């Protein structure tokens, strides 16, 4: 849901 870290359910990030 961030955008730091891989790519998390919606945003392109974990953190």
Same mark, same amino acid.
């Given at each position: 849901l961030v955008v730091i870290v891989q #790519?998390? !359910?919606? #945003?392109?990030? !974990?953190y």
């Open positions: #790519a998390d !359910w919606n #945003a392109p990030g !974990w």
